[PDB]
Amino acid sequence: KAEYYNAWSEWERNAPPGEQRGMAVSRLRDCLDRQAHELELNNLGLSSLPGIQYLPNVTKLFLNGNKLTDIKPLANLKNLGWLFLDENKVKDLSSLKDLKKLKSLSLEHNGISDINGLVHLPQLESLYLGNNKITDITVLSRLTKLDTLSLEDNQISDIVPLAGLTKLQNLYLSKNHISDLRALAGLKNLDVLELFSQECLNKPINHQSNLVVPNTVKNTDGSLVTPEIISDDGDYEKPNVKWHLPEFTNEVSFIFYQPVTIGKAKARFHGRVTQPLKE
């Protein structure tokens, strides 16, 4: 504990060129001294953590509203059940690998794209990944104990990794790039499902005066969703969206609004497909 108090003072003096490192050192000492289960470090602006070697009574770590980029210091908090890292800048989760009791992880607004470190947390029950940069969700197929998964406001178009996650009950997928719901067809245990605000972007094609674009928006059974609104006087004749474009234009689009039911869960699958055109 002398060595701990010491490490923490050195760290307190390395604030980069508005971090509340005094308050943090106070909280760390209070936590260690009382062998507390909770270490509350929210909104301190911290850009790093010192060495923390042995807080094995700590089961709840609150770090919302800091600016951490490296969570290697958390690696030995092996008894953590709840970890909150909202609005940090963490971009690799491999340092969590020995946290086998972790049940809840919040990591909103970190800008993370590489979530492969989740492979080490098969017992996770709640995972909050809203507002990140996630395109590749293939790790999530390992997280078969999740009850709650937020993936909203990411860059996800391939949801196949969720297809076997039948335990899922709360699933937030709004503000992604999802046009095909088939991966959700077996998720009949859902209560909450959010699928609004999709913005899907086709690869460019050449402009033609008679344009014919296959519809790519699919229900959970693979059937095509009839567009609601089509740009530029276009029409729909399944399976195609059609336009007459006597002059070049650089894009056309269409909007879809589809009630979905998966088990008991009811949601609106609602979004836009954009088709860029090359002259």
Author numbering: 36 to 52, 55 to 87, 93 to 321
Give excerpts from the publication.
InlB is a surface-associated or secreted protein that mediates uptake of the pathogen Listeria monocytogenes into normally non-phagocytic cells by specifically stimulating the receptor tyrosine kinase MET on host cells. InlB consists of an internalin domain, a B-repeat and three GW domains. Using this approach the biochemical properties of the cap + LRR fragment, the IR domain, the B-repeat, the GW1 module and the GW2 + GW3 pair were addressed. These experiments showed that a cap + LRR fragment is sufficient for MET binding, but that the IR domain also contacts the receptor and contributes to MET activation.
To address a potential interaction of the InlB cap domain with a binding partner from the host cell, we sought to replace the cap by a structurally unrelated domain that still initiates folding. The structure of YopM-InlB at 1.5 Å resolution confirms that this designed chimeric protein is properly folded. There are major shifts between wild type InlB and the hybrid protein in residues on the concave face of LRR1. The side chains of InlB Gln80 and Asn84 form hydrogen bonds to Thr646 and His644 of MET, respectively, in the crystal structure of the InlB:MET complex. Due to their relative shift, the equivalent atoms in the corresponding residues in YopM-InlB would no longer be able to form these hydrogen bonds. Instead rearrangements extend to LRR2 and to a lesser extent to LRR3. We had not anticipated this medium range effect, which can in retrospect be explained by a slightly lower curvature in the N-terminal region of the protein due to the absence of a 310 helix in the first LRR of YopM. The reduced affinity of YopM-InlB for MET is presumably due to the exchange of the first LRR along with the cap domain resulting in spatial shifts of residues from LRR1, LRR2, and LRR3, whose side chains are involved in MET binding.
